[PDB]
Design a protein around this ligand. Structure first.
Ligand SMILES: Cc1ccc(NC2CNC2)cc1C(=O)N[C@H](C)c1cccc(-c2ccc(CN[C@H]3CC[C@@H](O)C3)s2)c1
Ligand SMILES: [Zn+2]
Length: 316
């Protein structure tokens, strides 16, 4: 029969486009290997006329594509692009309403943890190393978050519909961000073992598990020492744009102007629901597309974010 061809573009980054002549006899899979159009898998689909001039993602099967992919995503995981595309096929159908001047996500597929992560990222100063996240984060801030959400899912190895932990999600994202200048100095004091000082850099400089209260962390927290006597750990020095204080969910009171934003978590381990509390002129509770306002808050909180620049203790 007649051999028909169209010109299309292939890519791994949607920056470097590569002109290809495709036979309309054969599947994309027979000519490129696994191929995606706007996240949708077309590997086993024959080219349509409407495809002419369109861009298709392909797996890097040569050194040029492998390098462009690594430079863009900062990963060599062979399944990364397929997972990104599979997730994108879903997140492009989500609604991203502007709620309180920020981009949120209307609830679907257990995406409350992503909505809360996305709302937190918009409030804190953060530069991503992968251009993929830089580029998608810039679009997410402008209200176009489908790509950013699909990259978060891909980078965090989460299925669409699986409930995730906001603290684990932020931890992954922080590990792909420039925090080289973030520094934390801790002092642990025991009656027996004396005073020992530790300096933490990067992700460990901005995250703490065991208290929601920045003020309590500064005053001092009780931790088990090596000897088995209780010891006091306190913050001596903090240099970072923000700090993230996490703990297992507990009834907490949030007061206007004493924090930036917080993760509320109702329900049981791995099957609950996240809401985002933010401090503006009053306390805002952002629940996907749903918004409520209150002068004060009491609820089960698991993450609190406070802004920072430089803090030095007055203790000793
Ligand atoms: C949602 C989710 C997904 C995946 C994972 N995976 C693992 C962590 N990495 C691998 C976790 C969670 C999770 O649920 N996190 C919350 C913050 C959380 C964290 C820690 C503990 C708990 C809880 C314990 C008990 C609970 C029931 N309710 C309590 C809380 C308030 C009080 O009045 C009753 S929730 C949750
Ligand atoms: Zn001790």
């Amino acid at each position: 029969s007649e051999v028909r061809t169209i010109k299309v573009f292939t890519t791994v980054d949607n920056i470097n486009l590569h002109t290809q002549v495709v036979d309309m006899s054969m599947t994309y899979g027979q000519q490129f290997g696994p191929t995606y159009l706007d996240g949708a898998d077309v590997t086993k689909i024959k080219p349509h006329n409407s495809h002419e001039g369109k861009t298709f993602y392909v797996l890097p099967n040569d050194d040029t594509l492998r390098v462009e992919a690594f430079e863009y995503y900062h990963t060599t995981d062979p399944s990364f692009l397929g997972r990104y595309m599979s997730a994108l096929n879903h997140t492009k159908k989500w609604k991203y309403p502007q709620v309180n001047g920020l981009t949120s996500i209307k609830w679907a597929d257990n995406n409350c943890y992503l909505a809360t992560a996305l709302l937190t990222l918009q409030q804190i100063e953060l530069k991503f190393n992968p251009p993929a996240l830089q580029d998608a984060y810039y679009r997410a801030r402008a209200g176009e978050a489908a790509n950013f959400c699909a990259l978060i899912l891909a980078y965090c190895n989460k299925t669409v519909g699986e409930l995730g932990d906001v603290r684990e999600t932020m931890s992954y994202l922080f590990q792909h961000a420039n925090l080289d200048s973030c520094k934390r100095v801790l002092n642990v004091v025991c009656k027996t073992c004396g005073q020992q000082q530790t300096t933490l850099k990067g992700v460990e400089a901005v995250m703490y598990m065991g208290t929601l209260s920045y003020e309590q962390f500064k005053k001092g927290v009780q931790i088990p020492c090596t000897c088995g006597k209780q010891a006091t750990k306190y913050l001596v020095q903090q240099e970072s744009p923000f700090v993230m204080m996490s703990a297992p969910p507990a009834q907490y009171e949030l007061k206007h102007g004493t924090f930036t934003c917080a993760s509320e978590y109702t329900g049981n381990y791995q099957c609950g629901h996240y809401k985002h509390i933010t401090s503006k002129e009053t306390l805002y509770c952002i629940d996907g597309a749903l918004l409520t306002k209150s002068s004060e808050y009491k609820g089960p909180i698991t993450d609190v974010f406070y802004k920072e620049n430089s803090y030095t203790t007055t203790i000793k």
